[PDB]
Symmetry: C2
Subunit: 209 residues, 2 copies
């Protein structure tokens, strides 16, 4: 029914990214290479590279799997590969961390497969509740758990949010004005970044409806 | 002394990215994997993935080299590696193309090293003048050659633009208020995204001055 949803703007992304970079400047960690976790860490990685002056950005695709019956969570590196990053200080970046599985995994992967001089980890945001393993750097500690909608996820996030509504309410003949109401009601968003008509058009194109 | 400089905002990036994606929707190219050319294509790749619903994003670091005496230009893949992308339709993305060397190179590299089912190329912008090889997809053809300052390059671009000023001004020491004037004068920007004092502080940190 109701989900806590914060729409993050580009400006906030800039603020958070800049704040994260500034912590790294202050700690005097000399980053040679940034490894972005795809897809979440791509944008933050690029912005942080701009502020710090990093030229070498790489990325690793990380999948998140759940086992149906046991509800066991497993993160996995898709399209694994290796390169020689020895003599380098590596910074690993992702958008947001909770259980810390992704960054834990990426850190491990990077140590064994790229063998850098040193690895550190960073995210724009970290949720302290779910926090299992905690990132070396972060822009902002989240206290109030929420669903953060990032500007590089507006489409995907709105699609899923609209699907949760379509599934619960058993809507057959979708009404746009009805949807906007359900949306404002479940999520608190009266003006979604992508207009909900575009979202439906695209859900159709994708054979979701 | 004077350079044509357009400051690109986040909103414009969104427009261009969305417009590019829409051409791909319209052409009904079924993208399985996006390969972003680092560093330029990372942000566009992620936004395009959101609009199209691509989950698999990889990236390749491309360097640009010039031979001092001959002034010969050469793009090169740094930290090369391979993965198996067979049975996939790949889309290669970069921010902007002119001579088309990077996309030419990446296309080649991807064909030989990832061996996808098919490859196509895309950029936000393409300069028709310099255009040697032209991208399969693009948001916008540039007619008036300019220096486009993307939001993920605000620091790096301002640093270089300020350096061009410090160099012609044979000293490299300079007064903040004369810098702002030189900047407005050479480039037409009265309010740079990053304030020019921050830029000097960082040029120092970087031992550029």
């Amino acid at each position: 029914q109701k989900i806590p949803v914060k729409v993050v703007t580009w400006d906030e992304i800039v603020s958070l990214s800049t704040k994260l970079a500034e912590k790294i400047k202050a700690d005097e960690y000399n980053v040679n290479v940034i490894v972005a976790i795809a897809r979440g860490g791509l944008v933050p990685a690029r912005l942080v590279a701009d502020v710090l002056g990093v030229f070498d950005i790489l990325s690793i695709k990380i999948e998140h799997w759940i086992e149906t019956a046991s509800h066991t969570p497993e993160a996995k590196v898709k399209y694994p590969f290796k390169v020689d990053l020895s003599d380098k200080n590596v910074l690993i970046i992702d958008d947001i961390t909770d259980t810390g599985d992704s960054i834990e995994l990426a850190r491990k992967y990077v140590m064994e497969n790229f063998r850098p001089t040193e690895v550190k980890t960073a995210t724009l945001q970290y949720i302290k509740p779910a926090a299992k393993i905690i990132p070396d750097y972060y822009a902002e500690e989240i206290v109030s758990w929420a669903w953060f909608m990032y500007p590089w996820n507006y489409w995907e996030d709105e699609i899923n949010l609209v699907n949760k509504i379509l599934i619960e309410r058993k809507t057959k003949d979708i009404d746009i004005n009805e949807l906007k109401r359900n949306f404002v009601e479940s999520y608190g968003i009266e003006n979604p970044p992508i207009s909900l008509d575009k979202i439906l058009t695209e859900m159709k194109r994708r054979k979701i409806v």
